[PDB]
Amino acid sequence: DSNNIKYVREDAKKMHKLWAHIRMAMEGSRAIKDNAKEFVPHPDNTKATTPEGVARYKAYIERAVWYGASANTVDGMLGQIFARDPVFTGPEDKFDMLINDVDGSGLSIHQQARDSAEDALSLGRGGLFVDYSARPYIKFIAAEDILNWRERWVNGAKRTTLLVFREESDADDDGYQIYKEEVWRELRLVDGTYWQRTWRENDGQLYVDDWISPTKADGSQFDEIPFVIFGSKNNDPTIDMPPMRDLVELNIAHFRNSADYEEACFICGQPTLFLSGLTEHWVKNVLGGAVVIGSRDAVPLPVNAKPELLQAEGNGMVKEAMDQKERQMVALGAKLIDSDKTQRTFGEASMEAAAQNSVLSRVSKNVSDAYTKALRWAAMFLGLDEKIEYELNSDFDINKMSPEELAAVISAWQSNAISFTEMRWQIKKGGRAYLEDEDMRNESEQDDPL
Amino acid sequence: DSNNIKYVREDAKKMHKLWAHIRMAMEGSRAIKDNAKEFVPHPDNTKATTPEGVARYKAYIERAVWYGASANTVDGMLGQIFARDPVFTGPEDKFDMLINDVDGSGLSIHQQARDSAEDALSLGRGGLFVDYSARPYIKFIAAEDILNWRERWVNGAKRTTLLVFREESDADDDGYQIYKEEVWRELRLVDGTYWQRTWRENDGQLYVDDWISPTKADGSQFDEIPFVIFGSKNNDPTIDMPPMRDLVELNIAHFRNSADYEEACFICGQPTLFLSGLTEHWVKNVLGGAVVIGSRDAVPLPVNAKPELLQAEGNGMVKEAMDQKERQMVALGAKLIDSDKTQRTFGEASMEAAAQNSVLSRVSKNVSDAYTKALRWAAMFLGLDEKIEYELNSDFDINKMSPEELAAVISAWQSNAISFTEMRWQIKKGGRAYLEDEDMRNESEQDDPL
Amino acid sequence: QVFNDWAYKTMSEVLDQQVELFNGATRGAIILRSAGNTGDLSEAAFWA
Amino acid sequence: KIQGLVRPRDPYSNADVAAKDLRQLVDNTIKVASGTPPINIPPSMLRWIQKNP
């Protein structure tokens, strides 16, 4: 109550820490080192209280190495899902405005879908908002910017009644605004009618705009809020666990083991003479506090003296732990590294292909469904056809089609089992065509050169 | 920590540090050896205080070896992207003035596209500017030149109302005295109109010109700012993440380990006699402060003497650390080495190609879209056709096309599946033709030469 | 949402007094509506 | 900056000229640490009135 617009749901607040961890793993190594106190425990906190202790801790962290497997994993997932371009079903010239500048920024719909897929793969949450200005726009809401939602059953129907998200912008002014201007959008559903208003702050004040009920091209307002929360699991507001939690914690464990290993390498990695059976009389007499060790110089020692070059040997247990964690990272199925030494047999991998591509297929289907819903709502704004679809590239492991594959596709087209558009989509999918189907049609209807 | 609490976090001031690190990594061993301190912390600050300590630090650094894997990485990455040349769609006899010299300097559009792709690959940000001078010019603006920008949502659309970038030029006075005059361009979008002005600082004072509205050939001013920012992530004004941060970390860590290893090799790599159980009386009697070690002469020793050629033994833990960091660098997916030992079954490389070419395809798409926008804006300036496309190479790991592939593409073109221009593009892409299709037709109207 | 659900062994003695005495169980004599309100009082005025 | 970088010379004479060194200067950026006194925000007071912590 009391109009607490900036409120955040408790479950989302609980998940915010893990979201920050995943985002910081996405950041790189500087974010991890700048926040290393919460990842790598101090070898002894008694020193950490002291200033020489914090200096030692900073030296310990700074020498460490961030392997950064999670970011490469996410890049690989986005490259696999977003190969070629998502196919659009239905009239195009009427929807060209949405395809070209999806939110009026000039950013194409494909790039926004790519960002949505990346955010639904890394931390498994996002949002697509459709607002009417004339032109409708499709927004992308970051997973951290959804603040509140509700699920009240009306006549036993799962409905999203309340929905508050944070909109970020720099106000177009004259003076240099070092501050960020924060805009809160409130979306509500009352008796099957969609209402929205905007909260804006200034000088600590809060402004509330009048309720406005946007209407379709014909009218009739709405019965549902035009907002979808896409995620890895399903397109529901309920929190979906991020797919990258285990890989990120594996990276953290490998990072701390790497810190320990780098400390060992810095300290005991160099050979040391370690003269034994030596008396200071001999040292001050002949050694003179200096040893010349090159092959051009030979140093004498007294009776019962044994020089012992001592340095830590390889294949240690910290190295074994680091390599074990790298192997586990690979095992979890992330497209994280390419191991040139290890070999894989063709054909056998075609059985586990469906297993590895599980998260990829789930995210592709979820993002395609969310974009279909958004485009249907935009059509409702514009009064266009509803039976249109936006399907991501659901066929993974893309590669060039061999001559045999191309001949098979063509022969399938000769029979009345593949549509000409489907043939063109397959040919482009194999990287053998770039011109549009209608363009080549018009170019080839003319008589052959001969 | 609560991200809902206000924070401002977008400006190049955030990213100069890592951008500069990327730049000096791209420069090579000169910059890295030169700016050694931030990469290689001193072995001990207590030693570092003494002048002999700083002499020891230079002896330690000058011996190091910079692997320079990142420069070779971006080289291979750009090579894969810019194999053959990008394909231009639309009229050519009208757009020849833009293809031949994109910025009016004799620099073709393909070379500026290559520079833009290199910038997007290295630090993940670049910009394109189109300004009518008469002839419109597509300029390339570096990541450091883009100074300020703001985003304010207008009528439900995210619009980049303001953008400021530095314009670097060299002053040519009556003499050859090297100066550098800076120009600042403010691109402003007020009430759905495009406006610009120039700030000039001559001898310290900021002269300001008057606002102007570059208007299209037909008129009607504009509705968007002819400036597009591109990066590895997407075509958004927000800062995109450099694609080579973890790789540069790995290279720096390998550099410091190489410094340690080379210092060890210089010191303890030479075998040493380590004469034991020796008395100075015997030395001055027979040895006389000199040893003849060649196989022609022997050296006598007293009782209980054990000569010991001692030197550091190979496969040390620093050696292993360097090897593991090299394998980690190649593991992340960078085309940074070509090891002759590793064998790979053909076909599984095609399985992993989609993930391995993630960032490559992302950069290719982003630069293609940016240049499509730039060419469309130049067409608006010249009042020319709008349906023009310019896409880079989208198929990677390119190689000469096989005779079977040649027969397949020829047979497909004989059917109504591949357009003549598409077949010529494919065959040129395979290293089997060099002349343009139109000249081929002009040679091919007449009968068989026989 | 609970970290651990209650098993057969975890038959903690719930209570010894029947406490389902609200609305329908009590024919609306004791109601248990839900309505948040500020302050330490919530007074209403009606005509005498 | 070297002060006597440019010197007069006499081609006809032949005299020694003192050598010069290269000095460097070190800038500095000090780190200042700020904080916040502990602020009591118990939820009971914010719940007694209809409000949220």
Count the helices and strands in chain D (H runs, E runs). Answer: 1, 0
In B275-294, the residues whose Cβ lies within 8 Å of chain A are 275-280, 283, 291
Query: Do the chains contact at C36 and D50, CB–CB below 8 Å?
Result: yes
What does the radius of gyration of chain C's CA atoms come to, in whole angstroms? 19
Q: What angle do CA A309, A312, A317 make, to 5 degrees?
A: 160
Place of tokens 């757009």: B95
Would you say A139 and A130 are in contact if contact means Cβ atoms under 8 Å apart? yes
Strands A193-202 and A127-132: unpaired
C-chain residues near D51 (CB < 8 A): 38
Asked if C41 has any chain D CB less than 8 Å from its own CB, the reply is no
Which residues of chain D neighbour A4 with C-beta distances below 8 Å? Answer: 51-52
Name the nearest CA neighbour of B90 among B78, B82, B80, B98. Answer: B98
Q: How many CA atoms lie within 13 A of A147 on its CB side?
A: 19
Other CB atoms within 10 A of residue B201 CB:
12
What was the elucidation method? Answer: cryo-EM
Residue B303 CA neighbour count, 13 Å, CB half: 0
Contact between A33 and A61 (Cβ < 8 Å): yes
Candidates A440, A399, A407, A431; CA nearest to B429 is A431
Chains that touch D (3 or more CB pairs under 8 A): A, C
Q: Is residue D50 less than 8 Å (CB to CB) from chain C?
A: yes
Q: How far apart are the first and last CA of chain D?
A: 60
Locate the DSSP E strands across A170-253: 181-190, 193-202, 205-208, 227-228
Contacts of A233 (CB under 8 A, 6+ apart): A124, A240, A241, A362, A366
* Chain C residues whose beta carbon lies within 8 Å of the beta carbon of residue D50: 36-38
| Residue whose structure tokens are 């962290």 | A61
Name the residue with tokens 């990829």.
Answer: A360
Cβ contact, residue pair D51, A7, below 8 Å: no
Burial-class residue A341 by CB neighbours within 10 Å (0-12, 13-18, 19+).
exposed
Residue B53, CB-side half-sphere exposure with 13 Å CA sphere: 10
- Chain B residue numbers touching A79 (CB-CB < 8 A): 354-359, 361-362
Q: With left for phi above 0 and alpha for psi between -120 and 50, is residue A383 left, alpha or beta?
A: left
Q: What is the dihedral of CA A230, A233, A237, A238, to 10 degrees?
A: -160
Residue B246 to residue A137, Cβ atoms within 8 A: no
A21: three-class secondary structure by DSSP? helix
Is A4 at the interface with chain C, CB within 8 A? no
| Chain D residue at shortest CA distance from A5 | D52
Q: Are strands B157-169 and B146-154 parallel, antiparallel or unpaired?
A: antiparallel
Within 10 angstroms of residue A138's Cβ, the number of other Cβ atoms is: 22
What is the rounded distance in angstroms from the CA atom of residue B389 to the CA atom of residue B376? 8
The residue of chain D nearest to residue C36, with distances taken between CA atoms, is D50
Q: Is C36 on the interface with D (CB under 8 A)?
A: yes
Angle at A379 between CA A153 and CA A396, to 5 degrees: 85
Contact B126, B231 (CB under 8 A): yes
- Report strand pairing: A146-153 vs A136-141: unpaired
CB contact under 8 A, A309 and B304: no
In angstroms, what is the resolution? 3.7
DSSP H or E stretch at residue A14: helix A10-27
Distance from CA of A147 to the nearest CA of D (A): 15
Of the candidates A348, A310, A353, the one whose C-alpha atom is nearest the C-alpha of residue A335 is A353
Query: Is there contact between A and D if contact means ≥3 C-beta pairs under 8 Å?
Result: yes
The set of residues, in sequence order, having a beta carbon less than 8 Å from that of B74 and lying 6+ positions away, is: B26, B118, B121, B122, B244
In angstroms, rounded to a whole number, what is the distance separating the alpha carbons of residues A250 and A70? 9
Identify the three-state secondary structure at position B421: helix
Query: Are chains B and D in touch, 3+ Cβ pairs below 8 Å?
Result: no
What are chain A's partners, defined as 3 or more CB pairs within 8 angstroms? B, C, D
Instruction: Please report, as a single letter, which amino acid is at residue B200.
Output: R
- Residue D51 at interface with chain A, using a CB cutoff of 8 Å: yes
D to C contact (≥3 Cβ pairs closer than 8 Å): yes
User: Does residue C34 sit at the D interface (CB-CB below 8 Å)?
Assistant: no
Q: Are A63 and A259 in contact (CB under 8 A)?
A: yes
Verify whether the Cβ–Cβ distance A444 to B419 is below 8 Å: yes
Q: Which of helix, strand or coil describes residue A327?
A: helix
Q: What is the dihedral of CA B322, B326, B327, B328, to 10 degrees?
A: 100
* Rounded Cα–Cα distance for residues C26 and B399 (Å): 84
| Per-residue DSSP letter, B92 | S
Q: Which residues contact B243 (CB under 8 A, 6 or more apart)?
A: B121, B122, B124, B232, B359, B363
Phi (first) and psi of residue A363, to 5 degrees = -65, -40
D52 touches chain A (CB under 8 A): yes
Which letter, b or e, does each residue of A207-239 get, where b requires 16 or more Cβ atoms within 10 Å of its Cβ?
eeeeeeebeeeeeeebeebbbbbbbbbebebeb
Nearest to B391 by CA among B73, B84, B76: B84
Residue contacts between A and C (CB atoms, under 8 Å): 4
H/E segment holding residue B169: strand B157-169
Cβ atoms of residues B325 and A64 within 8 Å: no
Instruction: Please identify among residues 30-49 of chain D the ones whose CB lies closer than 8 Å to any CB of chain C.
Output: 48-49
Is D36 an 8 Å CB contact of chain A?
no
Which of D44, D45, D46, D50 to substitute to test the interface with C, most C CBs within 10 Å?
A: D50
Residues 6+ apart with CB under 8 A from B396: B80, B81, B353, B357, B360, B361
Sign of CA dihedral B31, B32, B36, B41: positive
A2 part of contact set with chain C, CB < 8 Å: yes
B112, B88, B93: which is closest to B102 by C-alpha?
B112
Which residues, in sequence order, are CB contacts of A261 under 8 Å at separation 6+? A316, A318, A319, A322, B321
CA dihedral B5, B9, B10, B15 (to 10 degrees): -170
Interchain CB distance below 8 Å, A298 and B268: no
B227-230 and B205-208: which strand pairing? unpaired
Question: For residue B135, how far is the Cα from the chain centroid?
Answer: 31
Query: Is residue A46 less than 8 Å (CB to CB) from chain C?
Result: no
Chains that touch B (3 or more CB pairs under 8 A): A
Residue A255's nearest CA partner among B243, B249, B37 is: B249
For chain A, positions 143-182, list CB contacts with chain B under 8 A: 144, 147, 166-167, 169-172, 178-180, 182
Name the packing angle between helices B317-332 and B245-268 (round to 10°).
160
Pairing status of strand B87-89 against strand A389-391: unpaired
Which H or E element spans position A403? helix A403-414
Alpha-carbon gap, residue B45 to B54, rounded angstroms: 10
Tokens 């007293």 locate to B302
Burial class (CB in 10 A: 0-12, 13-18, 19+), A283: middle
Q: B448 — contact with chain A (CB < 8 Å)?
A: no
CA distances from D50 to A176, A207, C36, C45 (A): 38, 20, 7, 21
Q: What is the distance in angstroms between the Cα of D49 and the nearest Cα belonging to chain C?
A: 4
